[PDB]
């Protein structure tokens, strides 16, 4: 695959971009946990899947019986990987490009995590699409948070929702989603 069109999709806090405290998320929404499978999982055309790249951390945080993530290719980065195809599902790679040079048949790839992952490669020309949730909180300020997005979103375009609903298919969107304390929406950017 050569230089795919990658998409970040993350979840984080208004308005500091919080997304992760000690290495685990501070929220726990099932909603927006069904969006990510929904979106990442969904391909366009028949005989086709996606791929989901994560950093090392992010992959072992994910309890071992739960991965490979189902029915997406799943590419883990380490400065440590060689190139190295696990089995059909898990590829072990040290960056982004080198790891889809690897693969066919994959429709869309998203960055799915972790910090260090995504502060990396917003900054990267392959990055075309930001899926953001973008969650709000009465007070944010206590929220338990270490860990955060470094986005330079003033080189970025929040398009209008039609533009999200175009790309997410037949998936609903619903506006001001509640859960606990925590109401959020749904986004997409471009670059500017
Ligand atoms: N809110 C959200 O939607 C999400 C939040 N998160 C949050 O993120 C946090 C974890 O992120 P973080 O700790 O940064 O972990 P990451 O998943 O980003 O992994 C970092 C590791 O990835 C590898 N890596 C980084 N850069 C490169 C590179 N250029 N080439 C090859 N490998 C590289 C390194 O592995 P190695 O050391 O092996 O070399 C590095 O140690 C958690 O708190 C979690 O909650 C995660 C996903 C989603
Ligand atoms: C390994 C990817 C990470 C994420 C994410 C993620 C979410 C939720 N939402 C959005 N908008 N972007 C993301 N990137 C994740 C960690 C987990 O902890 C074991 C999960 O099980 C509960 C999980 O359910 C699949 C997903």
């Given at each position: 695959?050569?230089?795919?069109?990658?998409?970040?999709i993350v979840a984080?806090?208004?308005?500091?971009?919080?997304i992760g405290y000690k290495g685990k998320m501070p929220w726990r929404?099932?909603?927006?946990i069904?969006?990510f499978?929904?979106?990442?999982?969904?391909?366009?055309?028949?005989?086709?899947?996606?791929?989901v790249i994560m950093g090392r951390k992010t992959w072992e945080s994910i309890p071992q019986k739960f991965r490979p993530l189902?029915?997406?290719?799943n590419i883990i980065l380490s400065?440590?990987?060689?190139?190295?195809?696990?089995?059909?599902?898990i590829?072990?790679?040290?960056?982004?490009?080198?790891?889809?040079?690897?693969?066919?048949?994959?429709?869309?790839?998203?960055i799915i995590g972790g910090a260090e992952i995504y502060?990396?490669?917003?900054?990267?020309?392959?990055?075309?699409?930001?899926?953001?949730?973008?969650?709000?909180?009465?007070?944010?300020?206590?929220?338990?948070?270490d860990t955060?997005?470094?986005?330079?979103?003033?080189?970025?375009?929040?398009?209008?929702?039609?533009?999200?609903?175009?790309?997410?298919?037949?998936?609903?969107?619903?506006?001001?989603?509640?859960?606990?304390?925590?109401?959020?929406?749904?986004?997409?950017?471009?670059?500017?």
């Open positions: 695959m050569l230089k795919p069109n990658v998409a970040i984080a806090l208004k308005p500091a971009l919080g929404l099932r909603k927006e069904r969006y499978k929904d979106v990442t999982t969904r391909t366009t055309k028949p005989n086709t899947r996606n791929a189902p029915d997406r290719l400065r440590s990987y060689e190139n190295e195809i696990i089995d059909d599902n590829i072990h790679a040290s960056s982004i490009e080198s790891s889809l040079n690897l693969v066919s048949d994959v429709e869309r790839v998203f502060n990396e490669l917003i900054n990267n020309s392959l990055v075309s699409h930001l899926l953001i949730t973008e969650i709000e909180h009465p007070s944010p300020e206590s929220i338990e948070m955060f997005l470094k986005f330079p979103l003033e080189s970025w375009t929040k398009q209008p929702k039609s533009e999200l609903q175009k790309f997410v298919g037949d998936t609903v969107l619903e506006d001001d989603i509640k859960e606990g304390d925590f109401t959020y929406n749904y986004t997409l950017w471009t670059r500017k």
